[PDB]
Ligand binder design. Structure first.
Ligand code: NAP
Length: 282
């Protein structure tokens, strides 16, 4: 009867709002955060809303194997299974550094270290968390995995014909092939050859991370036909990711992953959604 969810990176932003919506529907939700204080503060806010679903907190840093293992063991002990995983934790890989004359071209700085970390959080963190929780999801009557992506994850944002050839060939997609794409991107980043090798010149790591997350979503969906495993652009949302800029509120944006978490049992899998609408991987 009761259903269980984990949302990664849910002390704030879209993740927080996703926890709220799931708990409002009666789902037992584990809010997670890499920082304990931020996570406990967020839990307190959710407790104040008197939602039907129980809310719990557990620490989680998706880049830390010990942290991931501890979360998995907690879920195993508390629930014995998991029904929903939302892979929401993510970063943009940049740091901030006449009105018509105002030039913003240098305000966002990108470094190799930030690129590497962005890929580690957005992609390897999603993979690590999913791997750890998969045995528990396998015990659900209707498991769901929702990977939060971006419209910038469409293949058309990567000029490289080499990269698109691998990333777009669904029938031959493997985790090892995704590693080859990542490795080459990072090598090219470090060498200073992004333009020459057909990588996006700006928000480079973020875009690559999201294209790869979309491809990873397809791999998973094929391996686990009883699961609903979908990826979703939640929309351009006013969160700290964009330093407060956006068109949607975080609450409005969270509607989109929540719908994918709460699909009917005969619902789709292996698809990309732009907000509420099915969209192309291309
Ligand atoms: N807002 C948008 O316009 C937009 C558009 C498309 C997609 N998205 C995606 O939506 C997701 C949520 O982003 P948001 O807009 O809500 O941004 P946000 O407000 O910056 O929230 C990011 C969340 O991820 C957490 N996080 C970062 N690194 C982590 C790690 N290593 N382990 C665990 N958690 C970590 C953050 O924790 P801390 O508080 O500790 O940093 C925070 O809770 C991301 O995947 C993002 O790519 C957002």
């Amino acid at each position: 009867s009761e259903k269980y969810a984990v949302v990664t990176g849910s002390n704030k932003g879209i993740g927080f709002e996703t926890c709220k919506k799931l708990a409002s529907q009666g789902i037992t939700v584990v809010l997670t955060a890499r920082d304990e204080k931020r996570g406990l503060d967020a839990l307190e806010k959710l407790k104040e809303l008197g939602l039907s679903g129980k809310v719990l907190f557990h620490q989680l840093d998706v880049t830390d194997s010990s942290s991931v293992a501890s979360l998995a063991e907690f879920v195993k002990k508390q629930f014995g299974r998991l029904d929903i995983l939302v892979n929401n934790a993510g970063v943009n890989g940049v740091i901030t550094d006449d009105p018509a004359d105002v030039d913003f071209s240098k305000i966002y700085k990108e470094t190799y270290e930030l690129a590497e970390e962005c890929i580690q959080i957005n992609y390897f963190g999603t993979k690590r968390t999913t791997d750890a929780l998969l045995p528990l999801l396998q015990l659900s009557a209707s498991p769901r995995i929702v990977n939060i992506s971006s419209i910038m994850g469409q293949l058309k944002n990567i000029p490289s014909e080499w990269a698109k050839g691998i990333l777009g060939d669904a029938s031959n997609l493997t985790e090892d092939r995704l590693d080859e794409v990542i490795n080459n991107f990072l090598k090219d980043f470090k060498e200073g050859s992004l333009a020459a090798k057909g990588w996006p010149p700006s928000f480079s790591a973020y875009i690559v991370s999201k294209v790869v997350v979309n491809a990873y979503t397809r791999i998973l969906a094929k391996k686990y036909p009883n699961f609903k495993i979908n990826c979703v652009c939640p929309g351009f949302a006013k969160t700290d990711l964009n330093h407060g800029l956006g068109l949607l509120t975080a609450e409005e944006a969270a509607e989109n992953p929540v719908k994918l978490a709460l699909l009917p049992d005969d619902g789709p899998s292996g698809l990309f959604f732009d907000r509420s609408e099915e969209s192309s991987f291309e």
